[PDB]
Structure formats: C-alpha cells, structure tokens
Amino acid sequence: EIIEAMMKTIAVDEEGNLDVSILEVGKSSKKINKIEKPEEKVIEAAKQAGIGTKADIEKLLNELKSDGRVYEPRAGFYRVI
Amino acid sequence: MDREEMIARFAKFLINRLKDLLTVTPKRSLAIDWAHLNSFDPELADELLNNPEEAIASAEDAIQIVLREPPLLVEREFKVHARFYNLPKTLLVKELGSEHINKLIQVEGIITRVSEVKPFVEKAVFVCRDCGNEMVRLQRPYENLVKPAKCDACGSRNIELDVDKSRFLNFQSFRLQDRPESLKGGQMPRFVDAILLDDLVDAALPGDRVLVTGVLRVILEQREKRPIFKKILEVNHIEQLSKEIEELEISPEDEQKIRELAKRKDIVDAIVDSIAPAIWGHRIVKKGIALALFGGVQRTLPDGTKLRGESHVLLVGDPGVAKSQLLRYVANLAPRAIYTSGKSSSAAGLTAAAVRDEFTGSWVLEAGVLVLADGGFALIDEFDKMSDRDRSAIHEALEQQTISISKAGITATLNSRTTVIAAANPKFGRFNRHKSLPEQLDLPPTLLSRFDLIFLLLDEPDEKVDASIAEHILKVRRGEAEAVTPKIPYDLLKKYIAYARKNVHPVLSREAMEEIKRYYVKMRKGLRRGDEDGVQPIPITARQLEALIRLSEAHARMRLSETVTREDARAAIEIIEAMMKTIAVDEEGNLDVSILEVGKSSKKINKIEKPEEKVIEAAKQAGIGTKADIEKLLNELKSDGRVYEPRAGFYRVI
Ligand SMILES: Nc1ncnc2c1ncn2[C@@H]1O[C@H](COP(=O)(O)OP(=O)(O)OP(=O)(O)O)[C@@H](O)[C@H]1O
Ligand SMILES: [Mg+2]
C-alpha cells in the first residue's frame, strides 16, 4: 500500500513507467524523440505529425541541444547530428 | 666492519658463475646465488642482510680480485655488478614497510609505470673559474642534484658543472605494485617506486610480474617534516616471476578431485548453474560466460603469426537486468580478473598512456586494466563509457592482443592478452527491437565485430518470467538453501578453471571439423542475394567462423577433454544460433556488426534516397518508403550531410 500510494502521489507516468530511473515517460516521450531524430520546417513537420504540441516540441529540440543530438546549423535551422 | 675479512671470505667462496662470466666477453653482470652462500657460509649471508652498503662493494672488490690475480684476467677492470637473485624471504608490496629500509629485501609485484633511460651523473666533478677542479661528489640516482656551498681549496664560490669529466650512467624509474588480480582479497594497492641502473635498465615492461631484489633506500624531500619522506627501492637484481607464483596453487588431492569432477556427468550444466546462482535465468548468458572463462587454446604458427585464443563477451541490456551483478560474481570466480568500470578516474583506465610524473615531470608510461590482467580476464563494466583516447587502441588490444604506444618518446609494444567480458548500455536508455544493435550502442560499428558473443539482456513483461524472477528474489532474500548453494563451490570451481586453462589444450577432431564446415556452408549463401544485390546480406564471415572454432574448443576444455568432439561443436553452434536469434541483427541474418546497417532495408534504401518536401513526395510516389520511412531517411541524410539545409524546407546534398 505504501508503494502503491508512492507511485500515485508522484504520478510518474500515465501508464506507470519507472520514471524514477529513466526520466523519459517512454510511452509517448522516448518514442517521440526517435521520430524527431530547418527549425521553421521541423515545427511544421511536427505539427502535421502530431507527435507533440508547439510548446512541447520546442522543449524536445531544445533539450536535445544540450546533449548535442539536435543542433542549430544556422539562423532558423535545426538538423540532427 | 672487517671489510678486509669480508673481501677475503668472498674471495675464498668465489666459481661456476665466475667461469660463465669469463667465458662470454660482452656480459658484465654476475648472478650470485643466496642458496650457494648459505651452503658455503651463513655468516656472510647474515652480514649481507645486516648492511648491504658495505657488502655489495666488498663483494665486488673481491670478485674483481678473483678475476684479476687468477688466470683469464680481463684486460680492463670492467664493472662487475653483484646481482643477488635469491633471499630466504620473498616480501610483498603490501607487506613492505619502513622496517626494511637499508636492508637487502626481495619484493614481488607487477610493474605499472615505466620511465625512459636517462643519463644520471654518478661522480659529479665540480669545475670552478678559480682552482679546485678535482673536487668530486658521488651523487645518488634517486636523490636530486647537490651543489657545494664553497670550494675548500681556495674559498671560491664560482661553482659550475663539468659535464666533460662526469661519468653518466643509465637510469630508469618504474613503479612496482601489488598484483590486483592475483591478490584482490586484501584490497591493498599500496606500492613502492624503484630505480634501475646501467645493467638493469630496460629490463621489463609495464604489466609484467617481476621479482626485484634490491636495497631499500630513502630520499629526503624538504623541511616540512623532520623524519624521512619517501623510500625508493634501489633494485640490485630484477627477474620475472616463475610460472607458479603469479598463478593459482593446486595440491595432488585437489587435482584428483578436479579429475573426479570432470568425470562427473552433466559437468557443463553444473558449471553453468554454478556461475552466479543469485541471478535467476540467463542460462545462455551464463553458458557464454563459462565458455569465455575456459578460453580457447592459444597457438603460434611457425610463420610468425599468433592465433587468437580469447573469447570476448559483451552484455548489452536495458538497466535493471542484473547485468552488473553478472560482472561481480565472475570477477571473484575467474582465476585472474580485474573488475573495473568504464568511468575510470585513473589517467589510463584500460589503455596504457604516457603521462607526466611528479618526481621530475618526465613522461612515464602507465598501464591499465587491459595490461595488468595479462593472461587473465578484464570485466569492464559500462563499456559504452570510454574516453576518446581509449576508443582508438582497443581495436588493436583485441584483434592483435597488443598495445603499441610510441607517444611522448616512450616506444613500447605491450601485450594486452586479456579476455574482455564487458557489458554496455544503450545510449537512448532502452533497447528497441525495431532497430539494429549498433544504432543504439555508443560503441563504434567496427568494435562490435570483435566480441565473439554479444548477448542481449533485454527485459520483457511476461507474467511467467516475472513470477519466476520474483519467486527467486524472494527465496534469495528469505535465505533459501538451494538458491545460493551452487553445484560446485567457488574455490573449487576457480581451481578447476585454472587447471583447465593451464593443462588442458584441446585439439580439433575430424568430426567437429566436418560439423563446423557443414554449419558454415549452411549459413553461407543464406539468401544473401535476397532483396540486395549490390550489398547482399552476409549471414556469416570467416571471423565468426574463427569465433565458432574458439567456442567449440572452449566446450572441450570445460569438461577437460583433449579432443574437440562433435558435441562441443554442436553446443557452440547452438549458442551462436541462439545469440543470432536473440540479437535480431537483420531480416535475413545480415552481419550488421561491421557496417551498422542491414543491406536489404537500410543500406539499399539509403542509396536510393541520397529540396525536402519535393524529394520526400518523389520518394513516396516512387516507392522507396512510406511517410515515416522517408522521414527517417531525411533525418539520416541530415545527420550525414546529404540533406543539409541552406534554406527553409530544403534538403540539398553536400
Ligand atoms: N534474474 C534475476 N535474478 C535475481 N535478481 C535479479 C534478476 N534480474 C534482475 N535482478 C535484480 O535487479 C537488480 C539490479 O541489478 P544490477 O544493478 O546488479 O544490474 P543492472 O540493474 O542490470 O544494472 P543497470 O541497471 O545499470 O543495467 C539487482 O538487485 C538484481 O537482484
Ligand atoms: Mg549497474
């Protein structure tokens, strides 16, 4: 009951993935990063794809800019490494 | 103390060694035995053990006398360095302490650091502008340079170094450390640095087990502490360890019980169940690790080449599969194994490297796990996390089992004859069944072709396997008997593996060769032309054939048989087939372990795919791939440079 209440009060995921270890939800978070793997073009490409909202895909590519998977080639450009 | 008496006693004791020294002209060193001295005069041995400074010089003068006055006198009084290569007690680096300074000791260990040859000055002749040029100072090789405060002849202070009259000799500096794999229960890596001289210079390589025996000296550092600071072993004689000191020890009844266990039925199943009984399942992984432990026979053809006899295993899996534990139990079960991690804090974790030292800033070569474990195992956890320097030499330390490093003026061809039972993790976080193996692994594609066994420790949410592993975990936590008691005890299994790797050298048989040929020709031409003509999916290669031969010779050694029978070849073939099935390398078994792309669905599509919207529409109407297929194709081309974007909505090729 304590473990059941712990996973509920944290709300790790909508399906129960162990997000305490892998921060990615996995159900609809890690998969989207593989679909993502120009800046004005990839937002329009993700809009018709529906993998994530505008605010969501903005953080998906920016978080990848930290590790370096998705870099910014030029002004308004976004290409994977 | 009675120096003349010591010289007379040494002359009366000293003759076969002197005869052998007089026979060969260029040889100058003389190897004196301590057992001969004990059989002749134990008082001289006690005097040598008391004060080695007045003992080596007196013995040297005495052997020079016995070389001069008796016949066969050499024209020149060349330096005859007394090299005592025996002592009643063989100390260790961990046992060594300050109570052995200024006494002839015999410490054993393994060399980890090595310096270059330097011309150190022995008798520094000090020159001055005024008189007082004959002044000399007998400096020490381990100590630093000393300068006189004033010349006693005339009171002048214009001192200088006369490099013309100074006698320079060879000097080397190494670091003797405790054998980590041979001695790991103590967990004491304390070590003592040592110096080598004109005769002992360039005697051993880093990672070799040597038995050095010299006078433990000491050097003063500064005035920060009143007593001495650091001790430096002045090596008098160096010699490599024998073939029993650096290996396990066995008894006659131990050999008898090992033979009896070998005669026991289902020995292979017992060995597999005896490897890490705590972790449930992974029977194929345990069998592969066992086959890696009983490594194949290492043969050297007369043409000069050396055939490989080490089966490397890579355990790729998602976190939480107890892969790390697998690397802990085998670390203590294997005879010679150094359990390490990928995130190594040392400057040379696995590959040797030339780094600056602290004594004089001189470049010294320091070895790593892949060198100190010569003739053993190296369980490298988190193999995906390696520095860029180590990712360029592991390609040679596996195939050529050697490390040729020449940076910083330190040329050395080390021998990395280690079995790498490693375990890597996917860079994405979890392995995907719909993608290839090197596409999610941080290791380069060429590196994956080295490991003879690549097991996928992928977890699956199946009700049966989850219930089984939960029951096993509850049993191992409750303290159940048969859950932690293997069929073979750990010490006996370790001695068994040692005996098999030392005395059992199986040879191939015509039946096993016929079976291997049949399997190879069955695998070859395995629908290779299918869906790929330019790059037909290759099901197997000669490398993997050599790996299968090594695994077949591993199953014959596991049961202590000198002939690789048909059963061993069939077991190796079954293991290879299970690995190829659980890997899912390609649709038709293409060897993506070298290119990291299947020739049917990845490499073919890439060539027929290499604007953005216009080109994806053209691909869609021509039939190269669907929407997601062309999206992944354009992403791959962007990453490679073939869809780089100069403008918005543009995927031109460079
Ligand atoms: N078959 C099994 N039998 C017993 N325990 C298991 C089994 N599979 C997983 N475990 C448990 O999973 C836990 C984690 O394992 P461990 O940390 O040793 O390796 P790992 O989890 O694979 O490492 P990583 O998560 O970094 O891949 C351990 O406590 C272990 O007991
Ligand atoms: Mg771990």
End-to-end CA distance of chain B: 85
**Residues 6 or more apart in contact with residue B606 via CB below 8 angstroms:** B597, B633, B636
How far apart are the C-alpha atoms of B547 and B292, rounded to whole Å? 11
**Nearest CB neighbour to B635, from listed A30, A73, A80:** A80
B170: buried, middle or exposed (CB in 10 Å: 19+, 13-18, 0-12)?
middle
Whether the Cβ atoms of residue B216 and residue B103 lie closer than 8 Å to each other: yes
Q: State the helix-helix crossing angle for B490-503 and B542-558, rounded to 10 degrees.
A: 120
- The amino acid at residue A71 is Y
Q: How many CB atoms lie within 10 A of CB B228?
A: 12
The phi-psi region of residue B561 (left if phi > 0; otherwise alpha if psi is between -120 and 50; otherwise beta) is beta
Cα B323 to averaged position of ligand 2 atoms, centre (Å): 7
**Residues 6 or more apart in contact with residue B305 via CB below 8 angstroms:** none
CB proximity A79 to B under 8 Å: yes
**Nearest CB neighbour to B429, from listed A30, A36, A79:** A30
Residues written for chain A: 81
**Nearest CB neighbour to A79, from listed B320, B645, B649:** B645
Cα B647 to averaged position of ligand 1 atoms, centre (Å): 49
How far apart are the C-alpha atoms of B455 and B170, rounded to whole Å? 51
Query: Does the beta-carbon distance from B644 to A45 stay under 8 Å?
Result: no
Query: Does the beta-carbon distance from A38 to B638 stay under 8 Å?
Result: no
B391: buried, middle or exposed (CB in 10 Å: 19+, 13-18, 0-12)?
middle
Identify how the structure was determined.
cryo-EM
How far apart are the C-alpha atoms of B186 and B121, rounded to whole Å? 40
Query: Does the beta-carbon distance from A41 to B631 stay under 8 Å?
Result: no
Looking at B412-530, list the stretches that DSSP marks H as alpha helix, in order from N- to C-terminal side.
445-448, 463-478, 490-503, 510-523
Structure tokens belonging to residue B573: 């073939």
Structure tokens belonging to residue B42: 């134990």
Q: Which residue bears the tokens 């004109």?
A: B198
Q: How far away is chain B from the Cα of A62, in angstroms, using its nearest Cα? A: 17
Whether the Cβ atoms of residue B116 and residue B172 lie closer than 8 Å to each other: yes
Q: State the helix-helix crossing angle for B252-263 and B490-503, rounded to 10 degrees.
A: 90
How far apart are the C-alpha atoms of B458 and B431, rounded to whole Å? 7
Exposure on the CB side of residue B12, measured as CA atoms within 13 A: 9
Please state the atom number of ligand 1 nearest to the C-alpha of residue B321.
22
CB proximity B626 to A under 8 Å: no
Query: Which residues in chain A are immediately followed by a break of C to N over 2.5 Å?
Result: 37
Query: Does the beta-carbon distance from B645 to A21 stay under 8 Å?
Result: no
- The amino acid at residue B156 is S
Structure tokens belonging to residue B179: 């054998």
Whether the Cβ atoms of residue B556 and residue B565 lie closer than 8 Å to each other: yes
Percent of chain B that is helix, strand, coil (3-state, to 5): 35, 20, 50
How far apart are the C-alpha atoms of B591 and B540, rounded to whole Å? 7
Q: What is the DSSP string of B193-249?
A: EEEE-TTTTT---TT-EEEEEEEEEEE---SSSSS--EEEEEEEE--B--TTTSS--
Sign of CA dihedral B549, B555, B556, B560: positive
